[PDB]
Amino acid sequence: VISIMDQTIKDCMVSLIVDNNLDYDLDEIETKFYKVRPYNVGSCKGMRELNPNDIDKLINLKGLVLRSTPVIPDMKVAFFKCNVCDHTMAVEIDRGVIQEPARCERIDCNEPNSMSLIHNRCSFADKQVIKLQETPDFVPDGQTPHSISLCVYDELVDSCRAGDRIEVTGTFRSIPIRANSRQRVLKSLYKTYVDVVHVKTSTIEQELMQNKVDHNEVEEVRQITDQDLAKIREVAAREDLYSLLARSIAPSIYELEDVKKGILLQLFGGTNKTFTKGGRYRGDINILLCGDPSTSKSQILQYVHKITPRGVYTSGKGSSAVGLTAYITRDVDTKQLVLESGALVLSDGGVCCIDEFDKMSDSTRSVLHEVMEQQTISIAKAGIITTLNA
Amino acid sequence: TFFAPDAVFGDRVRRFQEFLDTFTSYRDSVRSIQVYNSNNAANYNDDQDILPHRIIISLDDLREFDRSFWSGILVEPAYFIPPAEKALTDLADSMDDVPHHPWKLSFKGSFGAHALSPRTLTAQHLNKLVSVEGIVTKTSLVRPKLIRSVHYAAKTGRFHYRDYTDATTTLTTRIPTPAIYPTEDTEGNKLTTEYGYSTFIDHQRITVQEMPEMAPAGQLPRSIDVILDDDLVDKTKPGDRVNVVGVFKSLGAGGMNQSNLIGFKTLILGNTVYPLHARSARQMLTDFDIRNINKLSKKKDIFDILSQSLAPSIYGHDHIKKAILLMLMGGVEKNLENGSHLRGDINILMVGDPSTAKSQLLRFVLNTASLAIATTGRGSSGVGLTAAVTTDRETGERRLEAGAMVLADRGVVCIDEFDKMTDVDRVAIHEVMEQQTVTIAKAGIHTTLNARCSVIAAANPVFGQYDVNRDPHQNIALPDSLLSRFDLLFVVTDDINEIRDRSISEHVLRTHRVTIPFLRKYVQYAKERVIPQLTQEAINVIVKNYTDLRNDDNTKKSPITARTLETLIRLATAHAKVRLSKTVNKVDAKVAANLLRFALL
Amino acid sequence: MSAALPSIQLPVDYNNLFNEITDFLVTFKQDKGPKYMAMLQKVANRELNSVIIDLDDILQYQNEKFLQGTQADDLVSAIQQNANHFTELFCRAIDNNMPPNLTRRYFLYFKPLSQNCARRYRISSKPLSVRQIKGDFLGQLITVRGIITRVSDVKPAVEVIAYTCDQCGYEVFQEVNSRTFTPLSECTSEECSQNQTKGQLFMSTRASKFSAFQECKIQELSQQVPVGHIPRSLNIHVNGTLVRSLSPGDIVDVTGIFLPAPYTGFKALKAGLLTETYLEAQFVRQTSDVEERVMELITSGDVYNRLAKSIAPEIYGNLDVKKALLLLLVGGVDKRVGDGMKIRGDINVCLMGDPGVAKSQLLKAICKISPRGVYTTGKGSSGVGLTAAVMKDPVTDEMILEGGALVLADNGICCIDEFDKMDESDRTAIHEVMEQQTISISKAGINTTLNARTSILAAANPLYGRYNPRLSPLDNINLPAALLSRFDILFLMLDIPSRDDDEKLAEHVTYVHMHNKQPDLDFTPVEPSKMREYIAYAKTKRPVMSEAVNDYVVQAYIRLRQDSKREMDSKFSFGQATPRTLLGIIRLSQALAKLRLADMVDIDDVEEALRLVRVSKESLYQ
């Protein structure tokens, strides 16, 4: 479809210029390639939902960008040379195998003269690789967020910073992969990826997308039952609300209200301020609590963690200053090394649930002072030196 | 139609009619089998609303009935067998025809010429019907194996057939025909294969050593594998002692086939394959010896003399000597009704500085020991373990190669450099020793196997000679239930005394310049006859002791457990066996006491 | 050729049968539209993906067709006997009539008959042991029952591969099997054949036939395990609709046709052909006069003590602990909170002391008697022994979460030995599973959180060597209170030698072995069978608490925390009698009541629970 579309498009551009007679000096531009990057296509249910029934279809996705491979070159066009004469002829990959001629071009001859493959001379597409952590929301449970990976391609490459919350659409895709790495064997059990059509170059376009008004802001982005909103603003009037809420907070837990309260504030915490630049005290509030054990002191962390969308619950000593950040593990799926956000970078946003704080490794929590103060984190370590915000 | 019936075959079958008609005993036996199947068939259908087809045949009949069919099958099982099995399947069809398989035979016997053991085998025995006995290892892990092929053919409908003759098929071999997998019928119509029509059979093949007991003085063992399938499969565990009826196959090309040494992989098929019982020597006591025992049994002091008979070379340790004796004896064995068995045997352990002859003695142990294997430190692999021999060996049935203890079941395991051995093993040892059994889930064959072997072990002082003054513990160096597990723990010391030394060196020199033969003889009969049972006479003494033991000793030293008690039990029972007494006696108690004391102190 | 690949006539006739199929199909009666027709349009409306067949309505179709003739050919006896053909052929019979195999879009499943339909009277389903499984049932449709391990992550498996000549056009449909394949090239197109030049074909993913299989291995229910040996495991085939329904640590009745797939061991190891086989999965299923059998126990009364004794009479002494083990086995009643949150619900028992007691011997006992009990030791059962690995399973497909220990024995007790030696990761998990119903593995290919319903029994030896009395409690005890907090019942068993009793025990041990039977003059121990029965009957009760018992409970509890803290510093201890102490006791009496079968929850049951409590510890004073 999109192919036909592009064709019609060029043809139309032409027919338009012709109306204009001389256009843009002159006919070269028509020969140039225009391409469709359709977006906004369908309401797709997550990923995990999808059936093999749809292997190839436009699909909508969302959520922050986990990790992204560097550009990986792709010769559409391989590059070959001959031992004789030499002739430089080169074959385009097309289908994913490169079938090289045994012999030979110039001489030809014959001669069963080695046809050399100049790897520095071959074409490269990057079509980059983005580990995607998808949030469909609408979580059916009991599922835990799937991670995705999409090949992008072309101009799309690198247009995305990691962590962006983006809307992109693309083609569902599935591929087998060879198991032995020696033998020709392929794994059956195909492995699925996304082809990555349009994102939401679109990068260059940016708010030119917002033109046409950008879809009435998704019709308010599904704001509450307006009536529900009224209920909210209504309950606000409840004078007890400050208390009543704290009650509603922990149904199971008894008494200890001021706790429930301070927490409630932790849910409402503060307001972010960028100053002119910097500023950025955010709203952050770090509450600690101790006492006699079995306080339910656990139970609460349970509750919050349950509530908290981005929160994470961790145990003292089940921990050290590293697991909170930057695993930088070998991807090993590609047999690659891959930067893995440790616990904290993930926890950026929402709250963090810390068991056995008093018991944390001294190495650990050295982390904290950075976090607590900075509210961000600077890892100069290993291959990449950076200060990430959590 | 095949190659058409041969009056060879025809007369073979026909000839085998009168037998089995006489002796008719089988004629109804099959009917019994059918009956059983029928009844079970009604149980499945009506209630919620099985047996094998082989029937044994005593070879005794043939000699009377047919000497030439006797002789013929024995010699030419190839010829005689198949037609016979045919006759059987036919009569079977006759018995109950109406409602709607090999119908094999065991071939009991009345063996044999043709009675030979795995040591003495072939080349004349090659391809004759044979009966060999011995231990079961390396066993196998069965694989189901397929049979006859079936194919649907559209649009022609119809059906196809196919068969497959294994190298193990029949017994005596044949010119092999590869049939591969039938498909794409000619004319070119494809063939849709169908299962559940196509028959299959489970498959298994195990190895059989020559009888360890009957083994020669010393030498390399010579074992032979046999294939067992379906019904025959799985009947026995590795380490079982058994006698197998099966033909000797030469199967396979011996290298003359591919033109470009060894030859002709040979194996035994099935067949009857009976599990047999053996103790837990050989020997021959005649009249005189048994008498000699009998008279000697009366001698009151005999036990000490015995205790002396062991150590021609060794001074002292008569306590220990006595100990070993008791090990040889071992407190009978008790398997409670519908309940776990009481361990009769005792595990022994010795500790001291080297030159203790600890190494040396163990040899002497092995000598008159009547079996069993010896093990030194590491040692392994698996010790007693089957290793679950992978893969198969043969046919696809993955072998279980019975290890030391299994093989040493019924027998004396020597553990040398016991300290050296890996805790990895030790974990198992806990099971083997106490639990008295071994269990294997590995991949794999899921079975628990029984090694009943008794245990002795010698291990160095923790470090250096420091054992002597060292604390009762940490002198140990191999906690713990280890320590508990050995029924006996012996601390020997190398500390010097000049008087003692002279006493030694005299003996020493003399060496350079009650006959043990009679020993093991005295042993075996004592072993099989007879169990002392137990007597309330002692029981008091024992409890008295034990309470004294936990009581004062836990202050003095440790550990004292119910284990201690049981050990006492086995101890007494053995001492009665030494006494030959069909009963337990309070004197024997006093002895076991003395010894246990010595162990403690 | 004839005389090669012979033909053999069989009573089986498919021609008439297929007709019979079309007859029963959608032309059916018992269930205005006939069930299969309507269902068939619901699929034809595109709404319904898979089609579940049931043989009972076939039984009814036949009794309709038997009587009420003409006599019609028996499908069932033929189906279960083959059924493999029956799948594909049935499929064709259907494909015609709707409101080729390449375009089907629907899955066909069958449901076996047990049943009351067996009782008609009318086998196909006899839930079986893998032991009970013989290699002669290959191709038969069979129903069995066993423990789900493995239980794999569905992966698309392709059936046939479509290439297109694009020169000769047409298509190239290559069916595919096992793990791997080599893609076809040139063109097999009959038009590209015999031409001087064959077309070149490249596959098209939209065309090909793919499937998501889902894999599992199943283990013997282990009650079925023969006295010896060990419980066996089995692989199973599942694809399409049936996928995802499976989870480890599941006890399910599965119904599927048992099908072989060729494999063997080391090449030097195979005579041929074996099969190595497989199993395929069509369908999965996860107080009359017996009250007399209970009543034998009941009428005698003193069932709490009687049974108490009746547990592992094999050992002399410690009736208290045994009595505890009783309730341990009983459990109850849990609760759910209204939102709701649940509260176990179960007992957590610690057994202290060393070396002897053969303390383990008890554990052996329980694990023996208790259905769904599992005996384990520290070094011992690996952490991944308790945890589940995601590992592919056979026949069906793929990446199966194979659980152990807890998952394996859940809803039933789990027994731990050398509890000191279990190290740390173990300790963590357990510390967690004290949340009950909770195990969670985030590692790698596992995001899942399993629910473990097991109960926990903990046997450990005191800090070396044994219980230094000079060592305080928790001194002589190596473990963290955090876990100890979880442990409901810590039975600390210490040994001070005593002339008199040691006589008694000594006698017991002499009498048995001397007798196989220890109890005499007079104790009737309870057959763990009928015992287990009575247990089943009690487990149904779910008692309710008196306000009074509630009150006394409270007061006492105050007294309990109060004295416990009044103890203050060390010795003695462990404090503090945390609420969990309370809650625990609540569950405890809740159990004692259930021994009465209750619903009353009388204050005596409580006071008992107390006596027991005070009894558990304080043994330190002797």
From Swiss-Prot, chain A:
Residues 241-390 form the MCM domain. It is found in: Nucleus. ATP binds at G291, D292, P293, S294, T295, S296, K297, S298. It comes from the Eukaryota. Belongs to the MCM family. Component of the MCM2-7 complex. The complex forms a toroidal hexameric ring with the proposed subunit order MCM2-MCM6-MCM4-MCM7-MCM3-MCM5; loaded onto DNA, forms a head-head double hexamer. Acts as a component of the MCM2-7 complex (MCM complex) which is the putative replicative helicase essential for 'once per cell cycle' DNA replication initiation and elongation in eukaryotic cells. The active ATPase sites in the MCM2-7 ring are formed through the interaction surfaces of two neighboring subunits such that a critical structure of a conserved arginine finger motif is provided in trans relative to the ATP-binding site of the Walker A box of the adjacent subunit. The six ATPase active sites, however, are likely to contribute differentially to the complex helicase activity. Present with 8800 molecules/cell in log phase SD medium. Early fractionation of eukaryotic MCM proteins yielded a variety of dimeric, trimeric and tetrameric complexes with unclear biological significance. Specifically a MCM467 subcomplex is shown to have in vitro helicase activity which is inhibited by the MCM2 subunit. The MCM2-7 hexamer is the proposed physiological active complex. This is DNA replication licensing factor MCM4. The lineage of its organism: Eukaryota, Fungi, Dikarya, Ascomycota, Saccharomycotina. The chain holds residues 268 to 667 of 933 of the full protein.
From Swiss-Prot, chain B:
This is DNA replication licensing factor MCM3. Belongs to the MCM family. Keywords: ATP-binding, DNA replication, DNA-binding, Helicase, Hydrolase, Nucleotide-binding, Nucleus, Phosphoprotein. Acts as a component of the MCM2-7 complex (MCM complex) which is the putative replicative helicase essential for 'once per cell cycle' DNA replication initiation and elongation in eukaryotic cells. The active ATPase sites in the MCM2-7 ring are formed through the interaction surfaces of two neighboring subunits such that a critical structure of a conserved arginine finger motif is provided in trans relative to the ATP-binding site of the Walker A box of the adjacent subunit. The six ATPase active sites, however, are likely to contribute differentially to the complex helicase activity. GO terms for biological process: DNA replication initiation; DNA strand elongation involved in DNA replication; double-strand break repair via break-induced replication; mitotic DNA replication initiation; pre-replicative complex assembly involved in nuclear cell cycle DNA replication; premeiotic DNA replication; silent mating-type cassette heterochromatin formation; subtelomeric heterochromatin formation. Present with 35100 molecules/cell in log phase SD medium. Early fractionation of eukaryotic MCM proteins yielded a variety of dimeric, trimeric and tetrameric complexes with unclear biological significance. The MCM2-7 hexamer is the proposed physiological active complex. It is found in: Nucleus. It catalyses: ATP + H2O = ADP + phosphate + H(+). One of its GO terms (cellular component) is replication fork protection complex. The chain holds residues 13 to 738 of 971 of the full protein. A motif (Arginine finger) lies at residues 484-487. Its EC number is 3.6.4.12. Residues 302-509 form the MCM domain. ATP binds at G352, D353, P354, S355, T356, A357, K358, S359.
UniProtKB/Swiss-Prot annotation, chain C:
Its EC number is 3.6.4.12. One of its GO terms (cellular component) is nuclear pre-replicative complex. Keywords: ATP-binding, Cell cycle, Cytoplasm, DNA replication, DNA-binding, Helicase, Hydrolase, Nucleotide-binding, Nucleus, Phosphoprotein. A motif (Arginine finger) lies at residues 485-488. It comes from the Eukaryota. ATP 1 binds at Y316, G356, A358, K359, S360, N461. Residues 303-510 form the MCM domain. GO terms for molecular function: ATP binding; ATP hydrolysis activity; chromatin binding; DNA replication origin binding; MCM complex binding; single-stranded DNA helicase activity. GO terms for biological process: DNA replication; DNA replication initiation; DNA strand elongation involved in DNA replication; double-strand break repair via break-induced replication; nuclear DNA replication; pre-replicative complex assembly involved in nuclear cell cycle DNA replication; premeiotic DNA replication; silent mating-type cassette heterochromatin formation. It catalyses: ATP + H2O = ADP + phosphate + H(+). Its main location: cytoplasm. Present with 166 molecules/cell in log phase SD medium. PANTHER family: DNA REPLICATION LICENSING FACTOR MCM FAMILY MEMBER, DNA REPLICATION LICENSING FACTOR MCM7. This is DNA replication licensing factor MCM7.
